[PDB]
């Protein structure tokens, strides 16, 4: 059983799932996810209706400070309380940076929606060459948490040549 400690100190992307769809007893459902710049209002990427996702982003995406997302989720009929994501980023095996958002409160059976700030670390010049020089090599771990369960985990990689 995982909690929100045993991810908080991790390291390195994890090398499998942490935990299965049907683990997901609350019926969470991303059906929109939308990341914009909080310096231009530029959208950055959006998608409509999936556990992994690959992003394809330009080089000038790692000279961002600030990002905001907005993702809208369904909740099945369970109440939902403390719905919280840690999100790791790691470049080799290197971490980048942690967020941890706390979700607002969760209407069940119905859509909810919720926005995220990240603000990105500084990167050096170097980490900055070397992350566009290295697609994929950019990886994250999601876990998304309910009373401090374990009842998500998402993957994704990066590339910022495009």
Same mark, same amino acid.
């Given at each position: 059983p995982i909690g929100p400690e045993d991810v908080l100190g991790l390291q390195r992307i994890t090398?499998?799932? !942490?935990?299965?769809?049907?683990?997901n007893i609350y019926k969470i459902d991303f059906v929109r996810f939308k990341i914009r710049?909080?310096?231009?209002?530029?959208?950055l990427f959006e998608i409509k209706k999936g556990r992994f996702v690959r992003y394809q982003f330009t080089?000038?995406?790692?000279? !961002?400070?600030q990002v905001g997302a907005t993702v809208e989720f369904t909740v099945g009929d369970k109440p939902v309380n403390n719905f919280r994501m840690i999100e790791r980023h790691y470049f080799r095996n290197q971490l980048l940076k942690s967020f941890d958002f706390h979700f607002g409160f969760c209407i069940p059976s119905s859509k909810n929606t919720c926005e995220h700030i990240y603000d990105f670390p500084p990167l050096s010049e170097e980490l900055i060459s070397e992350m566009i020089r290295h697609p994929y090599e950019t990886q994250s771990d999601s876990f998304y948490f309910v009373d401090d369960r374990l009842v998500m985990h998402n993957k994704a990689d990066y590339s910022y040549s495009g």
């Open positions: 090398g499998d799932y !942490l935990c299965s769809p049907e683990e710049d909080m310096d231009s209002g530029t959208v080089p000038a995406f790692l000279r !961002l400070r």
